[PDB]
Paper text:
The V-Csn structure was solved in two crystal forms; apo1 containing a single molecule in the asymmetric unit, and apo2 containing a dimer in the asymmetric unit. The apo2 crystal form was solved by molecular replacement using the refined apo1 structure as the search model, and refined with phenix.refine. The apo2 structure has two independent V-Csn molecules in the asymmetric unit and the two molecules form a non-crystallographic dimer. Superposition of the two molecules of the apo2 dimer onto the apo1 structure gives a root-mean-squared deviation (RMSD) of 0.45 Å for both molecules. In the apo1 crystal form, the same dimer is observed albeit generated by the crystallographic symmetry of the C2 space group. This is consistent with the observation that V-Csn exists as a dimer in solution based on size exclusion chromatography, although there is no evidence that dimerization is required for enzyme activity. Formation of the dimer buries 1830 Å2 (∼9%) of the surface per monomer. The regions of contact involve the loop between β-strands β4 and β5 (in Domain-2) in one molecule slotting between helices α3 and α4 in the second molecule, linked via hydrogen bonding and hydrophobic interactions with residues from the two helices and strand β8.
We focus on AMGs that potentially encode chitosanase enzymes that metabolize chitin – a common carbon polymer. One expressed protein showing endo-chitosanase activity (V-Csn) is crystalized and structurally characterized at ultra-high resolution, thus representing the structure of a soil viral AMG product. The structure consisted of two non-contiguous structural domains. Our rigorous analyses not only resulted in a crystal structure of a soil viral AMG product, but also enabled us to propose the mode of action of this previously uncharacterized chitosanase enzyme in the GH75 family of glycosyl hydrolases.
Residue numbers in the entry:
A (entry chain A), B (entry chain B): 2 to 224
Write the structure that this text describes.
Amino acid sequence: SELSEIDSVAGVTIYSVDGEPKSFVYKAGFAIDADGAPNAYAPNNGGTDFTANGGDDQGGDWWGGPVDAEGYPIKQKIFDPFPGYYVSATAHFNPAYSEDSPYRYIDSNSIPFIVLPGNHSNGAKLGDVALVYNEKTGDNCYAIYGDVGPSSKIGEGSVRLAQALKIDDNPKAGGTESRIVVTLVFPGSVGKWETPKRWFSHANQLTKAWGGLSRLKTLSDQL
Amino acid sequence: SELSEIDSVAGVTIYSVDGEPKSFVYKAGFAIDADGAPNAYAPNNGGTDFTANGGDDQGGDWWGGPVDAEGYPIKQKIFDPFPGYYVSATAHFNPAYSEDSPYRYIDSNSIPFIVLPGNHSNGAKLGDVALVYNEKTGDNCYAIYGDVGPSSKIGEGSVRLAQALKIDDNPKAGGTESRIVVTLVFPGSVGKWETPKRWFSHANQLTKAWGGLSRLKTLSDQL
């Protein structure tokens, strides 16, 4: 077999794929990561996700995004997409923008991105590209490794990636627990922030060199 | 008396203001410029503005945004805010993104920006900052010179700037022709693209040095 187990998370095996470019693959469900969307979090459950999923916004521990000097979530400004909403962070970021800016983070609503579990990146660096495939519908999309999830879970990506895969994109009730999504990651492919046009083109180039979606469909029968 | 006429458009006198930092001021209505908003234009009147307001989207003269090699408007991709909508352009732009990207242009929905009439920039360069004041309500906001309008009209700005001034922000039916908006432009203040946090902070410093909003309110009685 061209596939060799390199890792396993929550019952999902991750396989190294023989050949160039270097890649690994796994079949999992698809939870919705709204992190980075500028409407994900707001006071009093005003966002698309529950405020409490970012922590305590009243001077306790807030982990959902950047905080001020007193530990309160940053509120978006009049020049930000959703004034008064909190700034939701992703692990991948655009260095052009300050820590307190929604523009620093990857907008889950518009950018197809995958989540990898913490300590299970398997050599991938934030910004690396991937091909993502819904085996139930045939839908597929290129994506970046854009966020880090719990080390104990696997199979998660952005609101826009869900839309592209025809998976329910609602942050509260969406996603699927059915293991219908095949993710092919290209570790070492980018490793930095770049424009979506640039990384999408690169994902296309790597996928063609790797053997295309047709090869992924063939390999997916082993998963 | 601190004001000296430097220009006139559509019956609106534009005045330089004595002292540093250099500035000019005018009192005008506020038309809505949806250019740069990624939902402004789409085929078949799908955008927030009428498609015809961008020109001819059937291979003819299209001024609404970039076109392909055949002359038809560029459509947004799966990694753009509104896939399938046209790319709407502003005169001011972010050089980090390609001509065909909505991210290159100033998103009217989120960025407070003013329009100056073509051939009537009066020394201002795109990216320069301004203080904008609704004399009827007292609302005010800093903004950038973001787009170029018809040479025969004056008083126009972005959807977000309308929101900040509590003026109807609808691209089709909004804005006002009542001369209630006082715009104080700082020519030579920035003259390039930079993050909103940077230019907004600089506008705040220039306004402090210039004498604050209270000075603009007093000067507005001469307009």
